[PDB]
Design a protein around this ligand. Structure first.
Ligand SMILES: [Mg+2]
Ligand SMILES: [Mg+2]
Ligand SMILES: [Mg+2]
Ligand SMILES: [Mg+2]
Ligand SMILES: [Mg+2]
Ligand SMILES: [Mg+2]
Ligand SMILES: [Mg+2]
Ligand SMILES: [Mg+2]
Ligand SMILES: [Mg+2]
Ligand SMILES: [Mg+2]
Lengths: 159, 169, 133, 292
RNA sequence: GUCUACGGCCAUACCACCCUGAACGCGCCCGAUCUCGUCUGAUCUCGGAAGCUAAGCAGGGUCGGGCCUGGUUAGUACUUGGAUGGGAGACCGCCUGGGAAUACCGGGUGCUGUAGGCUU
RNA sequence: UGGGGCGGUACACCUGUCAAACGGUAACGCAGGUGUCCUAAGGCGAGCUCAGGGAGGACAGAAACCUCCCGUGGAGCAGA
RNA sequence: ACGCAGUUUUAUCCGGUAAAGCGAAUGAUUAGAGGUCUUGGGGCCGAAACGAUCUCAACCUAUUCUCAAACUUUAAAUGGGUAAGAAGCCCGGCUCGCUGGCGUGAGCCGGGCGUGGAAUGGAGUGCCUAGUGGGCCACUUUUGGUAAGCAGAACUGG
């Protein structure tokens, strides 16, 4: 039977990677975290204050509050069927912005433009992603040479 | 030529170890202060030892360090006691040497009846310009191999300045 | 060893074993019953994978069949199915025989003991000066 | 013999430090506390003034931080005082005062509020703390980065602080590391501080020597002979420079053009050459055995 | 072409040893009245400007050690899902899909933001 | 409670692993610990460097004390 | 016409298990070449020494055979979490003891702009409430045990 400590099973997670111990490179601090931003979590164990629980390491969330040194985050959690929403206060050096929406943002702006410009033309051009389709009947050249000829090889008890 | 590659004496160290802790040490203090003109400092053990007869954190020894032109005088006196004859086996690979005296009275100093006799150790540290940078707290460096000192260079300095005598071993 | 002595000589060969007994065996001695079951370290044993090597012999070419005969007597001491083969290599090295002999007369391989030492064309030249002289 | 310690393994494990610590220039422990702003202001910058002392000159800057590097907004160097009259003594306590005062008045002009916020127009070396009046735009407020220097009593860093505070900035401080302070009684004098600013210590030392001995005098203060300055006008000298700064602090630059484009430095060697040295080296070595 | 102050990314920037360094700089360097602290103006603080590239720093070199990145190792090892497939068992092969790391062999050896100097 | 009793506490708590690369996961499963200790071993500021290794120095020796060089943590931070 | 989903796709993060590694750290271990490094010898040719000459418990340098549930530089396959638009984008103006070089931020007001990857189907919400609370097997992974139609677990299905 297992125990109930708050850091049971974190020998490696709350552990700094190879040749990256030391002081903290401090563009981490100078970033700007406004409300409504989407954020991912990763516990740095170099500093112990305000770090979250194991269950939130690797989860993504959303901001609702802002303090002097920390941030409030809304995170979902699956516990026995039902899912719950949770409001964990977390300090800055355990977070990072997420690029999981910038792709969407490049599109809507390009897409707004590409609509408005080239609207006078009259055509409703493609605006929405499509999957990978089949592959385009085409020719193949044998610029002279006959192909190579392969065959299997005999076995050998090389070791 | 060698305008700023010219040797000197950085500092001169002076040590006396006794073994005990008390009156002998006080007498020994008055010695060094009279030879230099400045108070020495008392040194403490590190860990305890039985056969030598000592405990931890008790004053044992006394040392002091001098600089400038006073050093040249004291060294000059010490070598008159030594007859300017040294061995190659007292020099080190860093460009430093030293020796030891069995009685301080030879230096031209009286004998107080209240104070017995004492021995002591000299150790000489050489140097040349541009060595402050190592202890410099602002932008510290390391000096470079063309500018370091050798066991051999120290010999010829000693041979030259005093017409000393190296001995075999 | 016994047969190999009796066949070739006391110094016609060199034999090496390429396994080590690092794993341990536990025993539960029933002189409670099945309570408190965790054994005592009686034994040591070695693990094997397929293709591994267990034994190897190093000798000359006129004594080939004696080498085979020796190992064949040995398989009857083990629990399993083993097999024997000759290697293309040179001795206990890792270089093909056809290449080795040319390759030592050209200063890529040096005979430093019971083995060799390969050297490439990357280091500092003072080692190329010492050789070729 | 003895085990080597710096080996192949040593370097595989090793971890280097940030570049400015290896150079020996920066203390990230303290820089953390200073530069970062609270996270509920979001872009309100945290200006710090910087003061550094070389062996021959003094630099004072104001700066704020971003991800890309610290932005500069105003700087002042002590080697452009002869434009204001001071010719010598460019490393002492006094040049720091003039240096900071120049800096403040230049800053205020750019924003626009140099008409107000004039500070102590008459120097006294007392304690003055500026006040941001109402109905007018708020006073500039910043902080001090000393750096690696010790803040003992009587540095040339606090002598620059005062020039800016008497010039019109708003800075928090305390009168322990000003000269004119007694540890034995914990009191401030406020006239000794004024002496250090005008340079009367220097005058005392010069007059001390001109009486006692002249060789050491010429050796110590040669360049006060060139420009023919004496102990009799120090106080008037700086007192006029102060008024000059208060009048025309604006700065101008220096254009120069049409440089001949000479390369005073050797470039890197290329791969083909590096492979050609070693071949002809091998050639020479072989040839010298056929020479035998 | 390059330096100074402040920095971001933190070895393509580190370690050892050799060559060169115009001008501006940066430093070495000379003293201890007052500020300040030292067993000792060595460090720290202050006042200076006779001389110097020796060092530090800058660039450059090593069939250099390490670091960064490719190739080979190898469609190998391993692996999702499947079968009234084999086999005494241990384990092996196949269908459908994914796919590594050493040894060994090559190349590279700091990018830059703000403010200000020299390069007439 | 591998029938119960004698033995032990798996009866409230902590670390690592088992545990099948989120989390969670059993057995009288492995290896160990707790019922305390601290006016500083709490809190601010400043300054400095650890373990060891080498070479030298009057008694001095394997080990007292002085000095120099190398030293990416190989030492310490009350206890597992 | 929106909303949903033991589903795939496109972007984007998390992990330290299999395998591999030890000429890379911790720990273990074999053999010989250049080291009397060096302490001493059942001893060694000898007055013996570092004159030699070996060696051994260890020991410097470059190589070598074999290992890790409680070691690891490296590093999968299957897996987990977000996002894929009207609760969006843009324009202009108001209030604030909050913060302040000037400014930021949040909130309120008034206008202009509709398809936003695949394939599926009707969603949501609230009361009262029973019987249960002894389990068992099979592939695969897996702990103790010589093994078990033995004891204890993870995945899905019965
Ligand atoms: Mg684990
Ligand atoms: Mg500080
Ligand atoms: Mg001096
Ligand atoms: Mg130089
Ligand atoms: Mg030079
Ligand atoms: Mg290389
Ligand atoms: Mg009962
Ligand atoms: Mg798992
Ligand atoms: Mg394994
Ligand atoms: Mg119920």
């Amino acid at each position: 039977t297992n125990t109930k400590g708050k850091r049971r099973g974190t020998r490696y997670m709350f552990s700094r990677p190879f040749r990256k111990h030391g002081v903290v490179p401090l563009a981490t601090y100078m970033r700007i975290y406004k409300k409504g931003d989407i954020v991912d979590i990763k516990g740095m164990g170099t500093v112990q204050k305000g770090m979250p629980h194991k269950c939130y390491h690797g989860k993504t969330g959303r901001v609702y509050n802002v303090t002097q040194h920390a941030v409030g985050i809304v995170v979902n959690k699956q516990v026995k069927g039902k899912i719950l929403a949770k409001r964990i206060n977390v300090r800055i050096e355990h977070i990072k912005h997420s690029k999981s929406r910038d792709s969407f943002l490049k599109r809507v702006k390009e897409n707004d433009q590409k609509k408005k410009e080239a609207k006078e033309k009259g055509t409703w051009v493609q605006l929405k992603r499509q999957p990978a389709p089949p592959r385009e009947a085409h020719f193949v050249r044998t610029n002279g040479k006959e192909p190579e000829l392969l065959e299997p090889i005999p076995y050998e008890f090389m070791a | 030529e060698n305008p700023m590659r010219e040797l000197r004496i950085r500092k001169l160290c002076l040590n006396i170890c006794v073994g005990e802790s008390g009156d002998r040490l006080t007498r020994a203090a008055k010695v060094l202060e009279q030879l230099t003109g400045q108070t020495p400092v008392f040194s403490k053990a590190r860990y305890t030892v039985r056969s030598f007869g000592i405990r931890r954190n008790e004053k044992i020894a006394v040392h002091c360090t001098v600089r400038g032109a006073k050093a040249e005088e004291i060294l000059e006196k010490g070598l008159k006691v030594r007859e300017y004859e040294l061995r190659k086996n007292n020099f080190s690979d860093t460009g430093n040497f030293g020796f030891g005296i069995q009685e301080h009275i030879d230096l031209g100093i009286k004998y107080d009846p209240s104070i017995g006799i004492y021995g002591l150790d000299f150790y000489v540290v050489l140097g040349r310009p541009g060595f402050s940078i190592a202890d410099k707290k602002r932008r510290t460096g390391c000096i470079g191999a063309k500018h370091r000192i050798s066991k051999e260079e120290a010999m010829r300095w000693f041979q030259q300045k005093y017409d000393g005598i190296i001995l075999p071993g | 060893n016994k047969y190999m002595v009796k066949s070739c000589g006391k110094d016609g060969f060199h034999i090496r074993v390429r396994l080590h007994p690092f794993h341990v065996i536990r025993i539960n001695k029933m002189l409670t019953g099945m309570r408190g079951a965790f054994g005592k370290p009686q034994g040591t044993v070695a693990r094997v994978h397929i293709g591994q090597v267990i034994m190897s012999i190093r000798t000359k070419l006129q004594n080939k069949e004696h080498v085979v005969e020796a190992l064949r007597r040995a398989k009857f001491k083990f629990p399993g199915r083993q097999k024997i083969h000759i290697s293309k290599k040179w001795g206990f090295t890792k270089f093909n025989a056809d290449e080795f002999e040319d390759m030592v007369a050209e200063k890529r391989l040096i005979p430093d003991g019971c083995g060799v030492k390969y050297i490439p064309n990357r280091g500092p030249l003072d080692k190329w000066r010492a050789l070729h002289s | 013999f003895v085990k080597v310690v710096k080996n192949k393994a040593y370097f595989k494990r090793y971890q280097v430090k940030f570049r400015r610590r290896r150079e020996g220039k920066t203390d990230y422990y303290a820089r953390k506390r200073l530069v970062i702003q609270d996270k509920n202001k979001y872009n309100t910058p945290k200006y710090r003034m910087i003061v550094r002392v070389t062996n021959r000159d003094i630099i004072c800057q104001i700066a704020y931080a971003r991800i890309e590097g610290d932005m500069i907004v105003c700087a002042a160097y002590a080697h452009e005082l002869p434009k204001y009259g001071v010719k010598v003594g460019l490393t002492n306590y006094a040049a720091a005062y003039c240096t900071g005062l120049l800096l403040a008045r230049r800053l205020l002009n750019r924003f626009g509020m140099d008409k107000i916020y004039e500070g102590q127009v008459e120097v006294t070396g007392d304690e003055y703390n500026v006040e941001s009046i109402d109905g007018q735009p708020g006073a500039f407020t910043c902080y001090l980065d000393a750096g690696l220097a010790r803040t003992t009593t009587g540095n040339k860093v606090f002598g620059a602080l005062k020039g800016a505070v008497d010039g019109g900035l708003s800075i928090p401080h305390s009168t322990k590391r000003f000269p004119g302070y007694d540890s034995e009684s914990k009191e401030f004098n406020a006239e000794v501080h004024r002496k250090h600013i005008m340079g009367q210590n220097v005058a005392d030392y010069m007059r001390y020597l001109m009486e006692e001995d002249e060789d050491a005098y010429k050796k110590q203060f040669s360049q006060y002979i060139k420009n023919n300055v004496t102990p009799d006008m120090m106080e008037e000298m700086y007192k006029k420079a102060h008024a000059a700064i208060r009048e025309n602090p604006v700065y101008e630059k220096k254009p120069k053009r049409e440089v001949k484009k000479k390369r005073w430095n050797r470039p890197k060697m290329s791969l083909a050459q590096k492979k050609d040295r070693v071949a002809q080296k091998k050639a020479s070595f072989l040839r010298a055995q056929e020479r035998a």
